[PDB]
């Protein structure tokens with residue numbers, strides 16, 4: 084019959100200890116056997132996987148590595164730590180606009196890179212906006228920016244999943 | 258839809274979604290406001306929309322203005338600040354029972370007004386209960402009261418949408 | 432007609448009332464396993480609306496052990512557990528060092544696994560109440576981070592074992608898993 088195409092861009096978001104990493108890793112294993120694990124944790128799993136460490140400028144580093152042609156698909160862990168890193172790389176973390184600009188540029192670069200990707204992507208991000216509004220301006224800035232980044236990625240993504248207690252709700256499916 | 262509750266976390270797109278719903282109501286829209294980011298929605302409001310400021314007693318002011326007969330529909334922004342105003346308008350914001358009574362009365366008045374309203378209403382509220390329970394009694398009370406208010410509005414409303422990363426989930430549809 | 436149901440949601444999300452409706456669907460004689468240890472307004476308003484045919488067993492820790500010891504599973508139509516949130520809080524505050532995560536995680540996982548076993552052998556159905564606490568901002572206290580992680584892990588286990596899982600939003604349940 085007809086050969087179905089899987090999803091090109093998948094966003095998995097959820098709260099702390101919600102199973103989003105394991106669910107996204109299952110998605111990535113569905114991509115194939117050779118998976119590019121782009122880890123964003125600030126530094127200063129299946130045995131067939133390649134781990135590319137990249138705390139910032141994910142589009143630049145991932146494109147330069149040329150590894151998109153080497154893998155079956157990519158799992159990005161995680162938009163949360165990327166947004167925080169972007170906040171902490173700024174001159175004044177109490178000032179929102181420069182952090183917002185840098186983060187929006189990072190997310191748009193990632194979106195553009197994914198549009199050209201020959202392999203599919205699953206991205207992991209956090210939901211941080213359903214608690215109480217914090218007092219310090221810096222924490223509110225981080226929350227706002229992460230929300231904006233998730234909005235951008237979910238608009239571009241083909242599938243969006245909201246993890247609750249290890250179980251996925253479908254927020255968007257092609 | 259006659260009554261729609263759109264609620265979501267911080268920077269979840271709930272305002273934009275409710276504004277598109279309200280634009281779907283018509284061109285003459287009553288923006289009932291209950292209050293960097295205010296200067297983005299002020300400088301974006303359709304000039305055929307009428308913005309009525311009403312920090313408390315929303316049913317009273319909206320009924321007295323007689324504007325229900327002059328507009329195509331209503332957008333309430335937002336139940337969150339209504340809950341906070343009601344809490345900090347109490348004699349002792351650390352005592353939960355009177356604040357709950359005042360807020361329940363406010364919400365029931367709004368519900369009654371909407372049942373008898375000739376135009377449809379879309380209400381925006383926040384989800385604040387899915388983080389860690391904060392220390393000060395006022396914050397816990399505010400969380401509790403907003404939760405109760407959202408429960409009331411969602412039960413009476415015809416359609417309820419839960420925003421995740423800019424995308425609406427249907428929690429209730431007629 | 433579900434054997435194990437997890438109802439979870441945020442603060443004041445209607446999860447207690449929804450789980451109580453589920454339990455009333457179980458039957459008329461319900462074992463209300465309460466884990467709170469005393470806030471008075473919550474408990475008062477909850478007890479007020481409790482059916483007089485329900486048996487309230489207060490059990491702050493070792494829920495599986497205590498419920499088995501009470502022998503009350505053979506006296507009721509079903510069980511409502513209120514709530515996994517305070518069960519985890521109790522487990523955290525019963526440790527020597529609440530800033531040390533691993534012993535707390537071990538204690539909570541053992542509690543949950545015992546509860547799971549008891550539910551597997553239970554002659555009556557169970558509806559469990561838990562909270563969502565992980566979608567706010569990452570708190571500062573290490574004890575708070577441990578509590579959040581542990582409750583999340585506990586909810587993951589319970590939802591994996593459960594037959595039906597519901598996520599309350601503003602009093603209305605979304606189905607996350609249905610038999």
Ligand SMILES: Nc1nc2c(ncn2[C@@H]2O[C@H](COP(=O)(O)OP(=O)(O)OP(=O)(O)O)[C@@H](O)[C@H]2O)c(=O)[nH]1
Nearest residue numbers: 266267268269270271272290292294295298334335
């Ligand atoms: N009084 C009054 N308040 C306003 C007006 N415009 C916006 N606001 C308030 O400004 C606040 C800022 O809202 P947002 O920028 O959308 O923040 P947010 O709720 O986290 O973002 P979303 O989830 O996308 O809605 C809102 O809660 C509104 O109530 C206005 O014209 N008058």
Ligand SMILES: Nc1nc2c(ncn2[C@@H]2O[C@H](COP(=O)(O)OP(=O)(O)OP(=O)(O)O)[C@@H](O)[C@H]2O)c(=O)[nH]1
Nearest residue numbers: 441442443444445446447465467473474477513514
């Ligand atoms: N010890 C004891 N605790 C109880 C009893 N009844 C209720 N509770 C506890 O009191 C708490 C009150 O719950 P709620 O008032 O509904 O607060 P909430 O969970 O944020 O609100 P919902 O989301 O609607 O469930 C629950 O967590 C129970 O654990 C009881 O009889 N004995």
Ligand SMILES: [Mg+2]
Nearest residue numbers: 271272335381
């Ligand atoms: Mg808003």
Ligand SMILES: [Mg+2]
Nearest residue numbers: 446447514560
């Ligand atoms: Mg409860």
